[PDB]
Amino acid sequence: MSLIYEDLVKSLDSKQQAYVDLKLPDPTNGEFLLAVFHMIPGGDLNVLQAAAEIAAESSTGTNIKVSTETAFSRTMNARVYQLDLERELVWIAYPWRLFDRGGNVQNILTYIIGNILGMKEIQALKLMDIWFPPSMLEQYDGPSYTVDDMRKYLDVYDRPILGTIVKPKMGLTSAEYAEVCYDFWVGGGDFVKNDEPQANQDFCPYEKMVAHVKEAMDKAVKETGQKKVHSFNVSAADFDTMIERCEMITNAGFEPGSYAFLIDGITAGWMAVQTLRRRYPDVFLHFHRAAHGAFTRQENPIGFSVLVLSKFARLAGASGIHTGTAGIGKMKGTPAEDVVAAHSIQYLKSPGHFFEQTWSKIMDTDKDVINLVNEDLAHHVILEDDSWRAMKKCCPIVSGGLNPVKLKPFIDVMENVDFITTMGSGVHSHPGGTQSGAKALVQACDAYLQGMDIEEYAKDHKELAEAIEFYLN
Amino acid sequence: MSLIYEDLVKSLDSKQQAYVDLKLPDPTNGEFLLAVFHMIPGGDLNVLQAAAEIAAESSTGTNIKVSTETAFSRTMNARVYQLDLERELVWIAYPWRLFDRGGNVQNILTYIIGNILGMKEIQALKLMDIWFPPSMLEQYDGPSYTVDDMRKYLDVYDRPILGTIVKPKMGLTSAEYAEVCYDFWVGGGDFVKNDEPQANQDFCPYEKMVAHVKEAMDKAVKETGQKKVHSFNVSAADFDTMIERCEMITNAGFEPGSYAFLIDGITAGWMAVQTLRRRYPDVFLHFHRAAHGAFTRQENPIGFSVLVLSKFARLAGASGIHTGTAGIGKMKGTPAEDVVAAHSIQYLKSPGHFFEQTWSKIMDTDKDVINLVNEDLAHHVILEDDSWRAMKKCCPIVSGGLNPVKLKPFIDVMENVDFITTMGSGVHSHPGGTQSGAKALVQACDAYLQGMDIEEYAKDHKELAEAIEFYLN
Amino acid sequence: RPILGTIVKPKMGLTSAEYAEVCYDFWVGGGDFVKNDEPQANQDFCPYEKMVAHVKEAMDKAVKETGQKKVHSFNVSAADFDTMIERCEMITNAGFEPGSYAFLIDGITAGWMAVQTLRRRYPDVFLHFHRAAHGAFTRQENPIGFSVLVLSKFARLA
Amino acid sequence: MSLIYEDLVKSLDSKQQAYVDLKLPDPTNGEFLLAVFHMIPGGDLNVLQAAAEIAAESSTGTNIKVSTETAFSRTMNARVYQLDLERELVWIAYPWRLFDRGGNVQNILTYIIGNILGMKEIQALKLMDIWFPPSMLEQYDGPSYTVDDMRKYLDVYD
Ligand SMILES: O=C(O)[C@@](O)(COP(=O)(O)O)[C@H](O)[C@H](O)COP(=O)(O)O
Ligand SMILES: O=C(O)[C@@](O)(COP(=O)(O)O)[C@H](O)[C@H](O)COP(=O)(O)O
Ligand SMILES: [Cl-]
Ligand SMILES: [Cl-]
Ligand SMILES: [Cl-]
Ligand SMILES: [Mg+2]
Ligand SMILES: [Mg+2]
Ligand SMILES: [Mg+2]
Ligand SMILES: [Mg+2]
Ligand SMILES: [Mg+2]
């Protein structure tokens, strides 16, 4: 085994022994959800003892062996099966029979990123990656409406979906809000999203915002001759107010496919996400992630990675989630963290950080799955008539202090154009305002698509020229 | 102003100028939600420029001033009004007109601990404290069912409510679960709670668990002549499953006051917390906080404090919330954090960290508020017939690696007994089992109340003597 | 010619998604009929509601690709009368093309009352009688019981 | 282990080895429905190959190992874990996860006293006893009305 490992194993209590199995036959057999954590002990206990306590507390156990313990309960124990003592990593196998039925995501998180995060026996504890076996992946929903469905509605292919966020973040009225929408759309933009805290403030009655946005869209659609989309912030105080807001939009007379529902998944919760997925499965569910920084940032030893968050959004059924600008914009931080996460939600097969994931439902050795993976890499729309085989894609939403000049840099690190980009400041701060602001973004996209440098395309494209002058000088 | 504070103000952009008012006349006038963050800038920006940036992003702004901005929108800018450069603290005033109506708590959190946690222009960002003006508090629910109401039902006063959590955390069946309930209650325990991830697993049908607990309670109540409570985990995949589980308990048909509803508030979400408060206002709402460590853990420089979590739980209407053992048990970590938070939710008037909080609704100078406060400090039940005057009590739940030998030490740090304590491993791991574990916990409470040393009290109480032997070895 | 069919194997262990792949593979390779292995039902890892759904999708594709109509015989055996009709009604509203589904009942373990309930409630669906446990009655080594002739004749009468 | 049992183990094919564990560490752990059959083989096959074949057909297996088999399906395999060769008895452990949910009894009997009764490879196959772990009993109804309730209506006692 190794002298060190045999000694670490001899150091375990009768309690700890039950949450360790460094000779686990097949972790990828289907019985388990696999997890890897960055872990650092917080004194008294050694690495294997601390890993055995973390496993106990995220599964069936507690601080001391209890008299109420059964033999059947021991079969549900999570078990430490692998360790990297240099990189300080811990591999724990979680029996997915531990999880609450009916496809509950908050329950998985209650175990693997719950109570364990507050244990004084750890100094750092970051959940880095997880593996969902086909047997478990089948118990959850997964996305029912995707970016492919949106693209079919918009008729927008082989480029990113060009979006904006209505800015100011707060303070505009329901009339002023709709003007910002109209101007972005009519200027050539595709998608408008509500800034995350914009809801029913006394000066912007939700009922009026919805009616004006519907009128504004109708105008932009007739003038441009092109379909447009609005992602509405549907987060509320409670279940009933959210549904009241969903139904306001649902009954406003929008053309099906032209409206999406945004939810602040971290603050509103994973229950509001699943509710929306299940109640409105033919509407694009946009997961905004405000407050994830406590979990995901480099500076924080305790929490979870952006890959984990992104993977759980796809499992829960989010049509899209914000994955970051790989540090090109205003938020932290890198292509290593952000593009790995985007690829885990975009593709059928991905590396990603520690566990390679194929989002099938059936075995990845079946010729038909191998085909789907190949077809996926060729940029063909899959799972239209064979949904049972795999979980559908969850779209990256790239936002955070971007502008037309930061587009080509982001696509280069991304290695593809199957994402939604949203630029607030980068559009509404433009010298000529939102319409010119939108044209600059459109122009920078056309430049990229026809292999040109923006400075060369800008020679006969005023809005992009002004943007380059403004966003650099 | 001062030499350095002058230079810092001269360094601000026309945009950053808009989110700074160091000469704010009256921050406590009632227009603002006051907040204080611990903050360190992350290169390129100075303290005031970073603070102006945070303020913009947590109210009405973005990284560049926008053409779409209005004079009316500027009225709602959050303002940096005070600093402590040595202690690295910044005070920001948030107009509560920013916040969504209908008493939406997730929307507050979306601004003040949302996107700003992810900004690369900070190294640390920890929200330490908040101040709710009487005007704002009236727009929120606050608790409707309190520990005063549960103590009335139970007929338990002048001591903590002594409870347990059913252990194993997972693996027991619905019938095995009900035996652990009965044994604790019949041994002298008041309160039984579902361990946070306990729900509808395949081997513990929720419907059977509920029915056996109904029967188990009746047997225990009848044998002890003493009323008992059960806190059920109603956290589910979605809204509709949660109400179905709540409604299953509602018709079980327990005696009113004998059941509470538990919600994994962080993972389930604030919308779930609010839904239960508004839907079941005459049921004790129990806020379990699994996953809070990402935000509240000292090792993490980005997030928010335990005081803040606890204060927003009372605002949303939890009848109780977990506050910690002040580092006496297995979680992190101190009286400075844990007792301050408890006191904020227990009492009408509190210090707490940076803002003194009187939870009135009306002006803290009315002689009637002064009386409520004097009466509260005397441990007299308030707000039975004058609820309009102030927001009600939110109960500290003290859990995490405690045993009867750690009961006194916590009370000494707490400075009172108005709380619920749950001991899972400290009861079920008793060498005599759950019934002896409960007897040991009851005996330790009596020893504390009587002012007797446990080692002395245990000379004529075997279950306590056994606990002292076991838990100190 | 004979109707060429399969039984989804393994007998137990596949999920509802995996089950439907086996169905698709058989029908697309030229097979006509797929039946549930007799003890395949609503086990925790193969939700019956999901199985019916994926089988409806799997079939549609196999019919489109082969240009040939296909059939699935669904194990409708349950704990009781009410659960059995719940399963039947799930299939009845899934919504398959009439003729493309049959109902399978373990007539010895479930009973002759389950066999007659399905005949009378669903007269326009093929009633597939599976005889698991008949060996105690029919087996030549057993002196007491009844013949395969008797069992088969009574099933025709029912 | 014993030379008689060692050669009996060595006779097992790849498929049969999957449904045998004579070293099952805890058959009463709660995961299994324990069974004991009085069995005699049907010629060609020995005691343990016949047992491993019965175990196969009573759980997840079939005559020949299949391409469609998954690692997750092998976890629900019934395992032969004890033998009394003189008494002609074989003990099989059945994962209760195999059985149809909602406390369906018809289904338990379709596995443990179904198709296996008609198999060529046995002369005798009598299920003598079974053992229900507490985890399993809680998934089933059990009686609601009893003779203690009848005796109270009747006032008939002792
Ligand atoms: O509020 C903002 O800052 C944004 O609207 C972007 O506005 P700008 O386009 O004006 O920067 C987004 O909410 C953030 O991108 C969220 O971060 P992430 O996508 O990283 O979750
Ligand atoms: O699962 C647990 O660990 C507990 O049930 C305690 O059990 P023990 O009594 O066996 O430790 C609680 O959920 C934690 O105390 C929560 O932490 P906090 O109270 O800090 O939110
Ligand atoms: Cl080991
Ligand atoms: Cl100033
Ligand atoms: Cl063996
Ligand atoms: Mg925003
Ligand atoms: Mg295939
Ligand atoms: Mg717990
Ligand atoms: Mg007065
Ligand atoms: Mg069969």
Author numbering:
A (entry chain B), B (entry chain A): 1 to 473
C (entry chain D): 159 to 316
D (entry chain C): 1 to 158
The authors write:
Ribulose-1,5-bisphosphate (RuBP)2 carboxylase/oxygenase (Rubisco) catalyzes the carboxylation of RuBP to yield two molecules of 3-phosphoglycerate (3-PGA). Five L2 dimers assemble into a rare (L2)5 structure observed exclusively in thermostable archaeal Rubiscos. MbR contains a unique 26–30-amino acid insertion between α6 and β7 at the bottom of the βα-barrel, and deleting this “bonus” sequence yields enzymes that are catalytically competent, albeit with altered kinetic properties, and are incapable of assembling into (L2)5 enzymes.
The MbR asymmetric unit contains five LSus. Applying the crystallographic symmetry results in the L10 biological unit consistent with previous biochemical observations. The MbR structure (half of the biological unit) contains 10 Mg2+ ions, 5 Cl− ions, and 294 water molecules. As expected, Mg2+ binds to the active site (5 per half-L10 decamer), stabilizing the carbamate formed at the active site lysine. The Mg2+ ion that stabilizes the carbamylated catalytic Lys-193 coordinates to O2, O3, and O6 of 2-CABP upon substrate binding. A second binding site for Mg2+ was also inferred from difference electron density at the interface of the L2 dimers (two Mg2+ per interface and 5 per half-L10 decamer). This Mg2+ ion is coordinated by a structural motif unique to MbR, which adopts a loop-helix-loop conformation. Although the search model was at the lower size limit for the Dali server, these results suggest that the structure of this motif is unique. Because of its strategic location and its clear functional role (see below), we named it the Rubisco assembly domain (RAD). The Mg2+ ion is ligated by oxygen donor atoms provided by the side chains of Asp-366 and Asp-368 located at the N-terminal end of the RAD helix αJ and Glu-179 and Asp-183 located in helix α1 of the βα-barrel in the LSu of the neighboring L2 dimer.
